[PDB]
Design an enzyme around this catalytic site. Structure first.
Site, PDB file in Angstrom:
ATOM      1  N   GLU A 214     -10.422  60.697 -95.550  1.00  0.00           N
ATOM      2  CA  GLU A 214     -10.377  61.950 -94.829  1.00  0.00           C
ATOM      3  C   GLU A 214      -8.957  62.230 -94.347  1.00  0.00           C
ATOM      4  O   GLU A 214      -8.291  61.354 -93.804  1.00  0.00           O
ATOM      5  CB  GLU A 214     -11.346  61.889 -93.653  1.00  0.00           C
ATOM      6  CG  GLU A 214     -11.387  63.137 -92.792  1.00  0.00           C
ATOM      7  CD  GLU A 214     -12.367  63.022 -91.645  1.00  0.00           C
ATOM      8  OE1 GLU A 214     -13.243  62.120 -91.658  1.00  0.00           O
ATOM      9  OE2 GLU A 214     -12.256  63.843 -90.715  1.00  0.00           O
ATOM     10  N   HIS A 230      -6.985  59.274 -92.353  1.00  0.00           N
ATOM     11  CA  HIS A 230      -8.036  58.257 -92.356  1.00  0.00           C
ATOM     12  C   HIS A 230      -8.232  57.677 -93.776  1.00  0.00           C
ATOM     13  O   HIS A 230      -9.079  58.165 -94.536  1.00  0.00           O
ATOM     14  CB  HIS A 230      -9.392  58.823 -91.937  1.00  0.00           C
ATOM     15  CG  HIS A 230      -9.444  59.448 -90.576  1.00  0.00           C
ATOM     16  ND1 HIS A 230      -9.915  58.782 -89.468  1.00  0.00           N
ATOM     17  CD2 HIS A 230      -9.207  60.719 -90.174  1.00  0.00           C
ATOM     18  CE1 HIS A 230      -9.917  59.604 -88.429  1.00  0.00           C
ATOM     19  NE2 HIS A 230      -9.503  60.787 -88.834  1.00  0.00           N
TER      20      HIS A 230
END
Length: 442
Positions: A214, A230
């Site tokens: 992400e 992420h």
């Protein structure tokens, strides 16, 4: 999920610009699709709900496999976008209403490509991604988010043949939180051990979570904003159970496959409280629209290099505004995300550098190289009341301790039942999306 026959699926048209040089762009005729969680789930050969409120029907869904055989997700017709889901488009601007009154709370949506059969995948390394935003009506407790995730372009249709809808029905959502609240994972209802979330009349959690990398471009309201990387090991969509999900509730936040905290650059948390806020004497005035520019720099300046730096600047009313800087004694004044910034700031904050454990900027870049799906959402936070974004987190922490204070919101703010009344008419707008080489989008 099977696809239902009660309503045609009609995504909202949303043109974006693909650019080759400053002010030299061409229109790409894309569209917006609603995430499958928000869809009516009913019997394949009827009208009977398989899911109502926050519960699956136990007669129809005694097991995931039986549930999947018996049930189907249905389409969103054009009339229902505004009337039911609070989504609308005007030209190149997309608007998402928080509460739409039969009462819908929040929304998550994805960008489809021009065929309207696959997600528009963005290969972001050595590129610039830009958009205009209005978060002036979002206050403490709300988040109008724009971000990328390592979903499959077909929502998993090729991998999971029981997924009949694919990207066309907004299936295959995953993110770096490995969420259990996703209703359909790997082509199957996530109905095993389904548990309602107390105080959330619409949501629950199933046995499995769904993990993938992400890249958060924009987690924000008018009080605070952040951008965050992420990585996960691996980056691609991965159904999880047990320790692999890194569940918060079992003390496994740092034991799973994804970096849940991420490496964040959040201006206020980095100790510049005057950069961003709702008023004309903040550097960037969140009461008015502005342009958010993100540049993904590689080691060699090519598409084949490793991801090394996430740079950021803004434009508001024609005024270029460079990013704020990290502002702590003895810490370099970083203004971007790099491995060094992540190590130094997490060191100061006393946060575990799980970003580094998951392969850091290089691993984040591998997700970006393969291509990621664009997500646009508006939501409140039933776990942590958005305090991580815009208040003191932990709430009991000393606000003078570096890393605790992320915004000016009170620690009593962001209770979903309160924000859903007080901010019912909040609307996030994302518009004039532009994508191209570095330096091409303004």
């Amino acid at each position: 999920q099977n696809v239902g026959t009660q309503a045609a699926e009609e995504p909202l048209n949303l043109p974006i610009s693909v650019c080759t040089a400053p002010g030299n762009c061409q229109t790409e005729a894309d569209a917006v699709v609603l995430d499958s969680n928000w869809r009516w789930a009913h019997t394949t050969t009827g009208y009977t709900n398989c899911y109502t409120g926050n519960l699956w029907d136990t007669t129809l869904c005694p097991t995931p496999e039986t549930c999947t055989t018996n049930c189907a997700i249905d389409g969103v017709p054009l009339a229902d976008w505004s009337g039911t889901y609070g989504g609308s488009v005007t030209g190149n601007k997309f608007n998402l209403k928080f509460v739409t009154v039969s009462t819908n709370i929040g929304a998550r949506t994805f960008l489809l490509d021009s065929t309207k059969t696959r997600y528009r995948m963005f290969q972001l390394l050595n590129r610039e991604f830009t958009y205009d935003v209005d978060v002036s009506s979002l206050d403490c407790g709300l988040n109008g988010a724009l971000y990328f995730v390592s979903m499959d372009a077909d929502g998993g249709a090729a991998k999971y043949p029981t997924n009949k809808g694919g990207a066309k029905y907004g299936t295959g959502y995953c993110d770096a939180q490995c969420p259990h609240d996703v209703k359909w994972i790997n082509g199957l209802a996530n109905s095993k051990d389904w548990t309602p979330i107390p105080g959330d009349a619409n949501s629950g959690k199933g046995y499995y979570g769904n993990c993938c990398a992400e890249l958060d471009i924009w987690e924000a309201n008018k009080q605070s904003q952040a951008f965050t990387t992420h990585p996960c090991t691996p980056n691609d969509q991965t159904r999880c159970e047990g320790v692999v999900c890194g569940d918060n509730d079992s003390g496994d936040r740092y034991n799973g496959m994804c970096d849940k905290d991420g490496c964040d650059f959040a201006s206020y948390r980095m100790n510049d409280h005057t950069f961003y806020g709702p008023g004309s004497t903040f550097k960037l005035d969140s009461t008015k629209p502005f342009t958010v520019v993100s540049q993904f720099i590689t080691t060699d300046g090519t598409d084949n290099g490793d991801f090394k730096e996430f740079r950021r600047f803004y434009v508001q009313n024609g005024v270029r505004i460079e990013n704020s800087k990290v502002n702590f004694p003895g810490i370099t004044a970083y203004d971007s995300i790099t491995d060094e910034m992540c190590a130094a700031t997490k060191g100061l904050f006393g946060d575990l550098d799980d970003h580094k454990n998951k392969g850091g900027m290089k691993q984040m870049g591998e997700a970006m190289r393969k291509g990621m799906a664009l997500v646009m959402s508006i939501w409140d936070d039933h776990d942590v009341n958005m305090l991580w974004l815009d208040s003191n987190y932990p709430p009991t922490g000393n606000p003078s301790t570096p890393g605790v204070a992320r915004g000016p919101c009170p620690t009593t703010s962001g209770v979903p039942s309160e924000v859903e009344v007080t901010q019912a008419n909040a609307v996030v707008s994302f518009g004039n999306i532009k994508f191209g080489p570095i330096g091409s989008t303004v």
